[PDB]
Each structure stands twice: as C-alpha cells, then as structure tokens.
From Swiss-Prot, chains A, B:
Required cofactor(s): Fe(2+)
Protein name listed in UniProt: Toluene-4-monooxygenase system, hydroxylase component subunit alpha
Keywords: Aromatic hydrocarbons catabolism, Iron, Metal-binding, Monooxygenase, NAD, Oxidoreductase
Key word Cytoplasm present: no
GO MF terms held by the record: metal ion binding; toluene 4-monooxygenase activity
Cofactor note: Binds 2 Fe(2+) ions per subunit.
Swiss-Prot record, chains C, D:
EC number: 1.14.13.236
Protein purpose: Component of the toluene-4-monooxygenase multicomponent enzyme system which catalyzes the O2- and NADH-dependent hydroxylation of toluene to form p-cresol. Also able to convert benzene to phenol, catechol, and 1,2,3-trihydroxybenzene by successive hydroxylations.
pH dependence remark: Optimum pH is 6.8.
Reaction catalysis annotation: toluene + NADH + O2 + H(+) = 4-methylphenol + NAD(+) + H2O
Keyword Oxidoreductase attached: yes
Mutant lacking the gene: phenotype: Cells lacking this gene show a complete loss of toluene-4-monooxygenase activity.
Keywords annotated in UniProt: Aromatic hydrocarbons catabolism, Monooxygenase, NAD, Oxidoreductase
Family affiliation: Belongs to the TmoB/XamoB family.
Coiled coil: none
Alphabetized SUPFAM superfamilies for the sequence: TmoB-like
Gene of this entry: tmoB
UniProt protein name: Toluene-4-monooxygenase system, hydroxylase component subunit gamma
Signal sequence segment: none
Pathway where it operates: Xenobiotic degradation; toluene degradation
Curated annotation (Swiss-Prot), chains E, F:
Family annotation (Gene3D superfamilies): Monooxygenase component MmoB/DmpM
Signal peptide extent: none
Protein's recorded name: Toluene-4-monooxygenase system, effector component
Superkingdom to which the source organism belongs: Bacteria
UniProt KW keywords: Aromatic hydrocarbons catabolism
Coiled-coil boundaries: none
Pfam family, one: MmoB_DmpM
Assembly and oligomerization: The alkene monooxygenase multicomponent enzyme system is composed of an electron transfer component and a monooxygenase component interacting with the effector protein TmoD. The electron transfer component is composed of a ferredoxin reductase (TmoF) and a ferredoxin (TmoC), and the monooxygenase component is formed by a heterohexamer (dimer of heterotrimers) of two alpha subunits (TmoA), two beta subunits (TmoE) and two gamma subunits (TmoB).
Disruption phenotype: Cells lacking this gene show a complete loss of toluene-4-monooxygenase activity.
InterPro entries xrefs: MOase_MmoB_DmpM (IPR003454), mOase_MmoB_DmpM_sf (IPR036889)
Entry GO MF terms: monooxygenase activity
Pathway given in the UniProt record: Xenobiotic degradation; toluene degradation
Swiss-Prot record, chains G, H:
Enzyme Commission identifier(s): 1.14.13.236
InterPro entries documented for this protein: Ferritin-like_SF, MP_mOase_hydro, Phenol_Hydrox, RNR-like
Protein name (record): Toluene-4-monooxygenase system, hydroxylase component subunit beta
Pathway assignment: Xenobiotic degradation; toluene degradation
Similarity annotation: Belongs to the TmoE/XamoE family.
Record function comment: Component of the toluene-4-monooxygenase multicomponent enzyme system which catalyzes the O2- and NADH-dependent hydroxylation of toluene to form p-cresol. Also able to convert benzene to phenol, catechol, and 1,2,3-trihydroxybenzene by successive hydroxylations.
Pfam families in alphabetical order: Phenol_Hydrox (PF02332)
Reported phenotype of the disruption mutant: Cells lacking this gene show a complete loss of toluene-4-monooxygenase activity.
Origin organism lineage: Bacteria, Pseudomonadati, Pseudomonadota, Gammaproteobacteria, Pseudomonadales
Keyword match NAD: yes
Annotated GO MF terms: toluene 4-monooxygenase activity
Quaternary structure annotation from Swiss-Prot or TrEMBL: The alkene monooxygenase multicomponent enzyme system is composed of an electron transfer component and a monooxygenase component interacting with the effector protein TmoD. The electron transfer component is composed of a ferredoxin reductase (TmoF) and a ferredoxin (TmoC), and the monooxygenase component is formed by a heterohexamer (dimer of heterotrimers) of two alpha subunits (TmoA), two beta subunits (TmoE) and two gamma subunits (TmoB).
Amino acid sequence: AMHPRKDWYELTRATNWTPSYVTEEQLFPERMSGHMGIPLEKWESYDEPYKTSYPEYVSIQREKDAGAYSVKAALERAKIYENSDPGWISTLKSHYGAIAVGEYAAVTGEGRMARFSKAPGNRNMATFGMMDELRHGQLQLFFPHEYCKKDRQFDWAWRAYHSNEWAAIAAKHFFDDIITGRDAISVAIMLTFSFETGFTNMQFLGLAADAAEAGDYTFANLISSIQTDESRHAQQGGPALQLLIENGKREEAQKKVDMAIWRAWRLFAVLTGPVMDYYTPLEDRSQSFKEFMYEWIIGQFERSLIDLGLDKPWYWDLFLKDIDELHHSYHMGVWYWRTTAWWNPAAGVTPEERDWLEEKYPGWNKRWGRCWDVITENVLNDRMDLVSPETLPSVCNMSQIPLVGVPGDDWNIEVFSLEHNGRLYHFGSEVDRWVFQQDPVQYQNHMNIVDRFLAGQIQPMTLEGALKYMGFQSIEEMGKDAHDFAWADKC
Amino acid sequence: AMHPRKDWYELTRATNWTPSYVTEEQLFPERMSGHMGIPLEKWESYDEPYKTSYPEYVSIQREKDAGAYSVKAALERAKIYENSDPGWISTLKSHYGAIAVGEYAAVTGEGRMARFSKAPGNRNMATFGMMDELRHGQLQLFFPHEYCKKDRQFDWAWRAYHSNEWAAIAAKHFFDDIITGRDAISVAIMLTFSFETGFTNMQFLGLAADAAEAGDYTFANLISSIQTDESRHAQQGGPALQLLIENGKREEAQKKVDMAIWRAWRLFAVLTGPVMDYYTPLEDRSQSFKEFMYEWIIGQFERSLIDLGLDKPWYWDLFLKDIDELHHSYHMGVWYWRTTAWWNPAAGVTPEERDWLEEKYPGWNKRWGRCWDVITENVLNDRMDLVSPETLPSVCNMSQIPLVGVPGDDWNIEVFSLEHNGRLYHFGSEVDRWVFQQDPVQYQNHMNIVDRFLAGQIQPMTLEGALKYMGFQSIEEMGKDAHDFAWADKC
Amino acid sequence: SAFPVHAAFEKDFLVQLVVVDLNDSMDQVAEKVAYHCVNRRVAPREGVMRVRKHRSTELFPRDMTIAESGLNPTEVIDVVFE
Amino acid sequence: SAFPVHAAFEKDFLVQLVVVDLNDSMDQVAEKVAYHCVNRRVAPREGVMRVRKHRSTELFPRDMTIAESGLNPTEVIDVVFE
Amino acid sequence: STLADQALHNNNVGPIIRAGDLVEPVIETAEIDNPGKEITVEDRRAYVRIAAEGELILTRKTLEEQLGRPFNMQELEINLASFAGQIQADEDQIRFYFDKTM
Amino acid sequence: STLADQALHNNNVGPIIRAGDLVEPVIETAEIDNPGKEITVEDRRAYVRIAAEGELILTRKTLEEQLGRPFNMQELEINLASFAGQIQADEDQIRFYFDKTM
Amino acid sequence: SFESKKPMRTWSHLAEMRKKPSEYDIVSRKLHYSTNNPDSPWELSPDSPMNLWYKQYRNASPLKHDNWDAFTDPDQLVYRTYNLMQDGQESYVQSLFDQFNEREHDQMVREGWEHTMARCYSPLRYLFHCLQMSSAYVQQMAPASTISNCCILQTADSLRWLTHTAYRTHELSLTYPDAGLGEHERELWEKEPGWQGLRELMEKQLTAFDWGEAFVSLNLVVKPMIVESIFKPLQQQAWENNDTLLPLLIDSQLKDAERHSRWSKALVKHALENPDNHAVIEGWIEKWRPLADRAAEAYLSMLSS
Amino acid sequence: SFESKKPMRTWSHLAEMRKKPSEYDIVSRKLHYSTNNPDSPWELSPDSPMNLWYKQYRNASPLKHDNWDAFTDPDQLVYRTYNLMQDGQESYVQSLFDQFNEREHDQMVREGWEHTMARCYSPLRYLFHCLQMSSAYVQQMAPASTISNCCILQTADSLRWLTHTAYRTHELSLTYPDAGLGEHERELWEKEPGWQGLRELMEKQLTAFDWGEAFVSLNLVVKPMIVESIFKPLQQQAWENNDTLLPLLIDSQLKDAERHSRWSKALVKHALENPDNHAVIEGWIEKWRPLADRAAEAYLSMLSS
Ligand SMILES: [Fe+3]
Ligand SMILES: [Fe+3]
Ligand SMILES: [Fe+3]
Ligand SMILES: [Fe+3]
C-alpha cells in the first residue's frame, strides 16, 4: 500500500529551524529575503493552496511535455510558416523573442524564493517553480528553433535579451525589476501574484484563443500547456500576501501589487495589444484586446485581489481609460518605427479592420484613424519616405516605451516629468512617475535608449548607428510592414 | 548493469519440445497449424527479422499511443468534420467502417499463429501481433466514436461487420478467408506477408499522404502510427515462406501468395481506389491510385517477393491491366448504388477532375466519361429518377463486388462462370474463378447477396427490402451524393 | 414464370440482375434490360437491339422467347446492337 | 549649439526627440518639429504654428530664440496652432 | 466605469480548461457535482471558461466517470490552464470558491 | 508492361519514415552512414521514402547525433512506417538490403 | 419503411446504457461478429473447415449463456491502460535486475542454489510458454470480445514471465557457468521426473479444444496450481537460500496472476447466471484436478530435494 | 552599414559549431544576459541593490574564467530528459515502498531500529532541505546557464530526497508510533550533539554568498562528505539491523549524488583551464574541510552508539 499525500505532506515542509551558529538575519538577510522583520515562527503558517510532491511532479510534467512535443512533431508539415498570414508569423516572432529568455530569468525569481523565503512551503513550491520556468525557457527556445533556417528574425528568440533593441530593454527593465532585482517576498507578490495571476493569462490563453482560430495548434497547445504550470506556481503569492496582511504589512503589500500591475500593464499594452487588435488577422480575433482585458484582468484578476483583502489600486480609473487608448498609440509607434523591431508589424488598418476597430472602440476613426489616413494616403501615392521616420521617439524612463497620447480630433498628450538628483526624467503616466518615486535607488542612474543616444553612447549618432547598437546583424532582421503594404490595395 | 538483448534473446524462443503424452500431430493439428508435414525440428530455424521483447514492447507502445491520443486531443476543435470537403468525411466513414472491427478480427489470425505455429519465434512475434491488432481495433473504434453525435453513418465504425451490407460482406468474406478461416501457416503467408507487406501500405500510408494534404493530421498521424506496428509483425511471413521453400513446398507457398494478393486487390480497388481518385478533393491527391499502386505494390512489394525467391504471379499482366481500369468501374457502381453504402460517395467528375483523370488514365473520357456524360446530363435536367437504380448489380461469387467491365467507345465486359456441384457461379475475373477452384470447400455453399435475394431470403424482395436486410436503421444512414449534386454546377 | 438473367448492355460498365418472363420475346427482353441502362449510363441510339448468350457470336432470333431459347435462369446474356 | 527638445505636435500621437539650435526662432523650431509630423501622421492646415512649454498656457513669442527662452535641454515643448 | 464596475462585481469561480479531452468531462462534472447551481460555459476554442456562483466543486469520482478512464485528481493539472476563485484541492475533489460576496 | 517492368526492376532499399521529428535526422543519417552512395528522398508529406541501391545502413550512434537527443535503436519503430528491402536490426544499427540484384 | 432518427451519443448497441459509456465499453464490447450467425460463424461456405471447428468447439460448448457479451473485465483494461500499467511494473522489475546485478546479488546466494535454479526455475520457460499458447487459444475461441480481450492480455503476461525467466537464466549463467543454465532446460522439461507431471498436464490441456473446457482447465485449475505450488514455494526456497531478488520478481508476476484469477472468477460469476453451468464447470474442474495435483506433487518433491 | 546575410541553421551563437547542435545545446547555452554588462548585470540603476549583490558575489569572485558559458553538463540533461529519467527512478522507488509495505517490512527490522531511525534518519529532512536551499543559491548566482541548469536539477534532487525521508518517517511511525517519528526531528536537529556539526556546517555554508565559494563548499566538500559519512554508513547499519529497504532507497539517492559529483568535477575541470583557479579552489576546500570533518565525526558517533 501507499499512504495518501495528506498524511505525510506536513513533514515535507517541516523544515524551519532556529539558527544558532549564525543569526536569523544573517541566514535570511532582508535585502534578499524581504521578510520585513516578521519572525520565522510567523512564516510557518504559510499554506500553499496548490500543492504538489516530487513523485507526482515528475510524472505529470513528463506527460505534459510528451503531449507538447508530440503535437509539434505531428504538425511540422502543416506549413504554418508558409501558409499563415504574415501578421500571425510576426506574432510568433515577437512572442518568442519577448518571452523565451525572460522565462529562463524567471528561474532566478523562483530560486530567490527557494533559498531566501522564510516560509517553508514557499521554498518547496519555489523549487517546483524553478523547474517549471526551466521547462518554459527550454520549450520556447526549442519550438522557434526550427524556424531559424527560414528566417533570421527567429534568431531573436535567443538573441533579444542579449541585445539593446528598445523592446528587449523594455522587457528586461520590467523582468529585472519584478523578477530578478528584488527580495524573495517582493518576487512572491510582484511576480507570482500580480504578474502571473493577472497578465500572463492574456498572453498565454488570450493569445492561444487567437492561435486556435488562426489554425496554429502547435503554438496554442504549447502555450496553454505552459500556463497549467503557472496556475500552480502562481499560487505562492496569495498566501504570502495574506501573511503580510495578518502581520501589519498591508500597506507595503498594497504598494507592491499596485506597482507590479502598472508595470506589467505598460509592457503588455505594447506587445500583446497590437498583436490582438492588429497583427492577428481580423477573422481570427476571438475578442478584442479590451474585451480580453475585461475578462482576465478586471473580471478575474481584480475580483481575486478583492477577495484576498486588498484594495483596487489607487490608479484604477486611469487604468480603465488607458485600456481604451494606450495600445492603439503603442501599435502606431511600433509600426512607424518598424525598422527597430525584430518582427514585421502589420498595420491592420484596411477598411474592414477599421470598421471592426470602430465597433470595439467607438471614436477610433476620428482619433488614430486621422493618423492612418495620412499614412495610407502616402502609401497609395508611393511617398514611402513619409512612412519611415527620421528621428527617435521620446521614451519613458520607467517603461522604456515611447511617450504617447490620443491623436486626431480631440488630441491629448501628457508627459509627467521629474527632477531628481540633478537630472530630468520623463514618464508616460502619473503612475510610472509614482513607481519611480517609490524606489528611486532601483532606477535613478538607469539610462533609457534615448538618454544613451544623447549622451554619446550610440555611434554614430544616427538612426543607422542606433539600429547597429540595438543588435541587428543584417538587413533582413529589421522589421518591415508585414504585408509589404499590400493592405493599401484594400483601401 | 543490464545485459543486451542479443545475449538472452535465444532463450526467449527456446520453447519447442518433443511431445510425449500426446502426439505432435494432436498438439499441432494440420487443419489449424498448416505445417504441411514439416517436422518440428525444421521449424526451429525460423528467425524473425524484426525482433522485439516484452519490456521494450510495452515501453515503446506506451509512447506510440501517448502521441496518437495527444494529437487527437489537441486537434479536436480544428473543425475537420465541419470544414472538410464532404468527400473527405466519406473517406473517413468508409475507412473506419471497413477496417476497425476487421483489425480486431486480425487478433484472431495472430492468435492462430501464437497457438498453432510450430515455429517458436513465430509464436512469440504473433503474441505481439495479437497485442498490436488489439491496439488497432481499439484506436479505430475510439477515434470515430466522437463523431457518432454528429452523424449516424459513423455508427458503422462499430456496426458494419455486424451487418449484411454488401461491402461489409465483401470485407468479411476476404478477412475471414485470409485471416480467421485458415491454418497458422496460411495466415503467416496470406495475411502477414501478402496483405500486410503489400496492400496495407496503400490504405494506411498512401491515404495518410492524402489526409496530410487534406489538413487532417489527427487521421494521418493515427494511421501512419498504426502502420509502424504492421511493419514489425508483418515480418512473420517472410521467414515462414523461406522455410516452406527450403523444405520442398515452394509450389504451395506460391499458390497461397497468388491467391491472397488477388483477393486483397479486388477489395482495395473498391474501397481505396474511389477514395484516392474521386473522393479525396482534387487538390489533395498526392498521387493517383495507379501511381500509388506502382510505388507500393509493383515497386516495393513485388520486388520483395522476387527477393525472397518467389515468382511474379501467373496473372501479372491481367493485374496490370486491371490497375488501369477496374476501380473506375467500381467507383461508378458504388456511386450509382450509393444508397446501399454507409458513406456518401463523391462523384468526382467535375470538368477539372475529368481533365486530371484523363491525364492519369489517358482514354478515360471516351470510356467511363461516356457514362458520366449521361448521368451528368440527367442531373442538370433534374431527371433524378435516372440517377437512382431500380435493380441489383450482379455480384462476384468470390470478391462479393459487382461484375464490371470497360464502358463506352471500346466497351468490353467479361463474366467468368463455373458450374460446380449442381450450381451456377459467376466471377469477375479469370483469377477469382481460379481462387475458387483452388479450394472449393472454403466457398462452395457460400451465398452472395444477390444469390440470397433470388433465394427468398431477402423480404420483401425489393430494393427497400434489401436496404433493410443490409442493416440500415434510418433514412440518414444510407449514402447520398457527397455534395448533393453541387458538382453539376461546375459543369 | 419470372425468369432472372444477368445482363450486360452494350457500352454500359456492368452486369445487372434483370428479371424477365418465361414467355418473353428477345425483343421484349432487350427492352427490359435497356430500361435499366439507356439514358442512365448509356446514350440512346438508332438501331435494332439484339440478345445473345454472354460473349456469344450467335444472336437469338428477335421473336424467340426465353423459353424456346434453352437459357437457364441466372445465365448471363448480352444486349447488343445489330 | 545643438539643443535637444522633446516635442509634441498638435493632433499627432506621440512625443518625439527633435534637435533644434540654440539661436533658433520659435518659428524655426516649429518648422523643425513639423518636419517630423505634418504629412506623416498629421494633416496639413492653414494657420500659424506656435511653441509653448508642454501643457503651458503661455505661447513663446514667434521671434524669441530657444536661447532667450530659458528652456533647458530635453525639456518638453508643444507645437500648436494659434 | 459602469462596464468595469459590472465586470468586477461578479462572484464567478471555476476552472479554465484548455482544449483537449478534459473540456466536456469537466463541464459535465461541474453540472453533476453542483446540483441546483447554474453552470456557465464560455468557449474560446483554445480554452473553455466554466463557472458558477460562489463555489464550484469537481470530485474525482464524478470526473473519472465522465472522462471514462481511471483518473487521479492531481492529473487535472495537465489541462487546468487557469481558474477563478481560491482553490482548495485534495485527493477527492477540487473546490473553487470566494470568501467574499461582491 | 514497360512502365511496370521498369518499376519492378529496381534495387531500392531503405526506410519509409512517417512525418515527425525523425524525418530529417534519418535522411542525414542515411547520407553519413552510406558514404559514396546516393540517397534518394521522395517526400509525400505524411511520410518520406528514403532509399539507396542494394543496401542502406542507419547506425544508432549517427542517428543519435543527428536527432540531437539520446536514442536507442529499437525506438526507431515509433516512426518507421514501412521499409523496402529485407531488414536486419540490432542494438547498433539497422541494415536494409536485398539478396538479389535485379 | 425507413424513419428519421437522430445521431446517438455512442454506438447503437450502447446507446441504451444508463451511464455514459467508458473507454473500456467503447473499444471492447461486442466485437466478435463471428457469433452472429450460428450456422456460419465466418463469411465463407457454412461447412468450411474453420466454420465446422467453431460450430463444434465454440457454439456447441456445454458451457452456455444467452449473453456472453455482457461479461465485464473487473479491471476494465484496454490496450492503452495495460501498457501504462505494465510499463510501470516492468520498468520496476528491470530496475531491480539492474540494481541487484550492480550489487553482485547472484554471487551471495547459498552454496548450491544455482543448481536448484537450473533444475527447478530455468525450465519454467517451457511451462510459461505453454500458458502463453493456451491463453491464445482461449482468446481465439471465446464467445465474447470482452472475454477474448482478457485472454489477449493474459497471453502477453505469459510471455512477460517467459522473458523474465529467459533473462535471469542467462544472467545467472554468467556467475555460474557450470550448472547447465541456458543449456539443459529442454532435456529437463522432457526427461526429469519433477517436470513430467506439469508437462503431461499442459500437453493434454493444449489439446482441449472446447472453449469452455479450455478456459476452465487453464484458468481455474492449472493457473491457481502454479501460484500455490510453484510461485509461492519458490519464494520460500529463495528465502532460505539468500536469494532476495527472486521473491521480488515473483511478487511482480503474482500481481499478473492475481489479475487473471480476477477476470476468471468474474467470468465464472457471469456464466453461473445460467444454472446448468454449475454442473458443467464443476465437472471439468473434477476432470482436470488430478493431473494438476500430480503435477504439483512431482514439482515440489523435485524442488524440496 | 548593413549587409545581407542568409538564415542560419541554428542560433547565431551556435552557428560556428562543427557538429549539428543537440537539444541540450539549443535550449541550455548562453542564457544569462545578466553577465553581458559588467557594470549593470540587471537592466536597472547600475547601483541598485541586486546589481551590487551580483557585482560583488558573482562578477568579483576570485574564481575566474573568460568563458564560463562553454561549460557542459557531462550528462547533457534538459528538463525533458531529467523528468524521463527521474520518473523511471522515482516510479521504481514508489514501487519499492508499495511492495515492502505489503510485505510488512518495517515489522521485521531488528529490535530498536526504529529508535535509531528516529535519531539518525528522520532528521535528515533538515539536512537535505539545506542542500536544496543551497543548490538554489548556486543556481541563481552561477555565471553560466549551463552551470545554473545543473544546480536547478540538483535543487530538485535535494527535494526528492527530502520527500523520501518525509514519506518514510511517516510510514515508519505507523508501525512504531512511540519513537517520536515525525514529532521530535526539529528538537534533534537543534539540540542533539550528533546533529550539531552538520547544523553548524550548513548554517555557515548557507551564508557563503560568493558564487565560487558557494559552489566549492556545497559540491566539493559538503555533498561528498554526506555520501561517505552519512549515506554509506546508514546502508551498512541497515544491513546489520535487517532493514533491506533503506539500502535500496539509498542506492537510488546515490545515483543522484553521483550525478552531482559528475557535473561538479566537470566544472572544476573547466575552471582549471585558468591556472590561478587551482589555488582559489584548493583554498576554499581547506577552509571548509574541518567543519565537514567535524560534522561527519559527530554524526557517526551518534549513529554508531
Ligand atoms: Fe513561465
Ligand atoms: Fe511562471
Ligand atoms: Fe492492424
Ligand atoms: Fe497488421
């Protein structure tokens, strides 16, 4: 006979002891552990709600991978790369570039907990978390690797985090801030709770729905399998938050959640927004980006946050307005500066798409539509110089993304600036400035790409000098319109 | 350490002994064993060329099924049933109906060997063969089962071998003759050598190629996985044939191969031929039926038969002519009598298809084209009564398939008849008559469906009385044109 | 005196069961076969239809009945044009 | 005396880095920003373009130079129509 | 924030099942194991969102019966792509639930 | 029977690999392990027909190196959908071959 | 005439089940079409040789039931789940072999044990292959596919045990190359008196062609005798001769054997719904028991001396 | 300017390899982007707290190599193949637990053995969790992803052993409910003298934050001492107290331990391409050895009395 897990599980996490040959603080230094002075004994009440044990883990994960790899192998000749809409291929390229090595970085957030959390159940669940992110890093290198021989832009699945390309900087600035650059309890709260019960469902399930509509089952099956792991190891954060609240640290907990959700939001708006509302072919759009937001972040995530005893973040109304607006502007920036991206943005503004955009975002044509009217007219009249830029966008000192506003008939744009320690910083929202002010030692001497351009570090100081600095190694790697402007014909 | 299989494999088949408490003949009766008087000791030189052992078997087959089921599960929402061409859906329905329970029957040919072969290596490889066919029977019931809720014709995946529908009779007459109705050595030679290195590659790999073109990877991945087992257990037949030849039985061996290949041919021409040249959408036809024949049966199978020391069968030139002709006529019979089929035949004669047919079979339009000219004219003129039959085809007393010839400008048709024991039989070729004459006790009192109709067994003696006799349980189950005649519009 | 024969009609692609009558002329048999053939799979044409035993060279006379013919039930006949 | 500013052009969707000159009139600055905007993402129009500090209510005079303006490098300006 | 208020003030809990062989068995299980609760289902092709108000139980014994093959509760993880509600899971069942009523 | 004669009189042997992760590794292995033989490949999407004249060897060590992961020769069965030639197989290699020369 | 009818959620023959059909039901039930026509099991001449064989040895068996097809494997195994189960068990056994080999287990058995193995253990390969053949026979003759499926897996299990025995015979011979391990087992099976009861038993059982008598003699007489008179005494002898691998291997094989006993008993329970079958089954058990007892007795006196 | 270049058959960093890249190469090599910028490991302020930590405890380590990333796991394990391997091994161990439980193995151990287990075996869960924590630390600090991958799997193996110990502690307590099994292990780890050497050793090792010293002290001093001074003496004691399960379980754990020693030695071999690293490594081994020896000695005198 075997004994049931309930009967012996407690011994697996009976691993706290009272240090004697070093102090408790030496063994769990606050800068790595982030226990906020809460003593070891209080952490023993931590109770991970989604348990696993080592023999079940290896067995089940064996089965998860068996299915992921089988499906990849069975569909290799489906001609996705050749038969898909090129906006779909670009979605793959940005996804793998923006995520694969970021998953592997997440091993280090989970390792931070496995070593430095004072909660014993956290240290074990983090050990499975380490293993999970290892899986996710290896899957999302292995899957795009077969496309290297087709297209050098797929080399950025591996290369992007090794570059200074603007979006890779945005991604690394975010992940280094919430995953690899803070103490264990901050990782529990900012990564596993805020990012991984909030936003990753958008990229890895919302996008899966579009992939399934697009007939790309290899990818949909991959990323929904990945998210099954997340659903387990993300449950490390709730129990940490509950403990912090029970021990007088509600305010600190709340500030960390508020900060992580805003930071995650700006990056997902520039990567997932354009994908969902523009790159994904019209007839594959399961829902709009905003509809998916209201399902996953407002309806599911925010309701969980309230259930755990936290508050709606102070910026909630700003956030809701931002969902209606920001990614349309971010799409435009990525598309106009497409040559600095390692994928091929689709403009997504054929008349049919513009009718859809107007339905999903009433007032769109009198705003962003005004910009796309000019661009589209230049394309029809083969004025292609007016469709490539000759300067840099100004960039946020927090999110690393261009500073944008609402264009057209009711034009509004606002930069939120700050002097600090003899330097002038610029932010794309009230919230991004606030995040900086919450922890200036984390950010103050960081230089965004435009800061670097003006400081002499990018040579020559030219758009070409900047493309070289960003890591592009051949003409084929820089982004182009996904359809070579064929969409203009539909106009 | 583990010891390599080469070092201990011989002990696994060291299982012949000299009987003492019963005689050798009692233990291996000739009617079940078919040893042709060759003594036990000669059979010990049998050496299966594709070995396996029990721990490798269970391990590897676990992995085969893991991949088959994963892929099915990952593609359930691809909408094959709704989005496929209806000729493709009909191909699925005939395949599962004509094969699933026939696979399960094949367990019994393998069991016949496992018990009654005097070759010890044969008895073990047959034990894996039993297991393989069990797999194949269960897969090809499990896969079509989810479509029951869509379409009653998928109920014939299970029902067909339990019916008296004409094609199910043809299939059972063949499989009971070569698989379940003869001694062990006959099964080795007729099933594992003749059928399973010859023709099953057509249905299970040739068709897979069309399925992959048709974008049905669940099915292509399934049936090519099935054929990997066949490739192993089919290797029981070569070594039996070699032994028979070494022991003076070449002539008996040759007659059994000749008979099994012809019998297999007529059934595959009526099921696989129409599928490959008519039901499969034009743009999914990897090769024509004849091209696949020349690849698999002439180029691969016949060359193996020669390599093993046998002769081209005496009917080779008849066979080659038949490849050019028979299935076009069989297609026509299945399509004109579609109401007696459990699938929906596609006529496959739009002008585009007829150009293809003419390229693949020069002279087609002046032959079968002449028939399809009349039919097509009746459809265009909505004379639908001229497109349904009002009598029965005459049917072969060997293959159970209608008697056909070449129609049109150079009309030729021939029935080969035989009186035997006070009864008149009719056969659709010289070879089918010869097969009967080779073993009249196997066939003589068998009654084909038309014999039964004329003998009073089908009541009422009407087409409807016959449809009821054939097992149809509702109006939806009987075959219809796959496209409801929409092809006439293309004309 | 239903009388089954198996009949192959000229230019058609198969042999079919047709039930004729014992007292039927070869003209009437040729009609009954044509019923299941002409304008279904075989184009109509001018000429006289004739009946022979399958693959025969002898035609049966037009007025001869199946009864006077010595055909046995279920034997194969061809229906052909002069 | 290259002088970087960050400039938001009326009806455009972003803020851009534009490098102006220390001795430049507000008229010349407004041209240099328009270069990267008008007929790219923003439709041309009649009217006088004016320059203000970002979100300001005060316009800089047309003849004033960035030098006489007291702007610091990398400060944000708006380019707007009267 | 009417649209947003209304989206936030829900008490929906339950599994999000990725496309595969667990979708229909779980829907059926949700209905059987929560009698007199309405089960809602939103099909997004790559996944299905299954919910009830306030609490949704899936028992291993029912899920095994609906799947039609031997099933251990921990295996649900292979297809549990997300969930709404807090979770408590054991060898016999998984419960999705909220502490508050919004 | 010119077409048929010519199709019959071949000495082609070698594996038919079903679609999947073994197709390119086997092609590459066939080339490396039979130097100075021409390897022909016919791609039918669901499977690939790989051949040489008279004999075609696949060694486990080369196949493991081309696949890029640990590989036991018996595992080839997962993807060996058919083959031309007689086969002799062991822990180290599989040989496809004919006794006669047509 | 023909009515309209809606699609069914499962096969037409399961469509009246109250419960949702399982994987087992869907892929295992009512697949022998050879029982549909009592005059012509197979679609051939009604008096073909194999039609006569089945009409005699299946249809005419004294063991009678009006619904054999309603038999259910208590374990509800399908091919898929058999391979999952046996891959786990056989991977465990192979790991035992590997680890006990590393530890040079065979060098520490009691003096002489290799000779007892060479006499009493390595010739089991013949006995187990007889089980294998015999299981395949019940498979092909049983009148319901759910019965036959149990036999197929039992046939595979027989081969499993056969292969264990082959592997260990060869391995043992490497430490003990002068006991005739791997060389003399056929002579032993044919001529050694301790093997002659078993060999007489199986040769006569293999020629019992009635499906009912085949099943009863194989599964209710022979195989329970192997468990009590061969498997368990061998474990005890291993214990006294410091062979700690053999008891673990035989405990794995006994799991298989218990599973065969389980479906067997369930088939007895199903057949006994018909009252006549009590005398039929009990008659065949009495017929075969003295051979089985003789076999056991000769084996044990060979083992215990 | 920008030239045209063709697609590559693999990542640009492997594209000069002579051999076709393996699964291992493709998914494991050169993934730490945090080593690219020596002034700012992480994309944040250059003097952020974690940037300082890494510049101090990774970049400034006395253990130096110009190409850490060329390190290769001798086992070339990836996540996929680790789970295949450990599912086989752990399925075997769980089957051992099941079978030895069936046989009521624990009731036959020598009188008093439960007391020796409760003192010397069940508190290992603390020790093994220390290995787990410590492995996770080398993971996060090591300067190449191929090194870190070895640590991740080693971290999982530590948890594996921890979980064995938890399972067996609980199971043993069911036959022996009056030895304090599952109740008194923390008091033992904190106060029993046989545990105090080990506990002092790990508490000080867990506060060695230099990645090089962390790796050397964990993998080259502590873990080899556990193998020779804990694992193997425990197997011998089990042998003398009729515990035949513990030696088999510990032989499974020793496979894991041998694998850690293998990648460790391979990392030493790689680092010693640089001549200075000999004195660095040897210095740290001398520093840590007396703690390790003290730990071992106290454990064994507790075990052997
Ligand atoms: Fe992840
Ligand atoms: Fe994660
Ligand atoms: Fe088969
Ligand atoms: Fe087969």
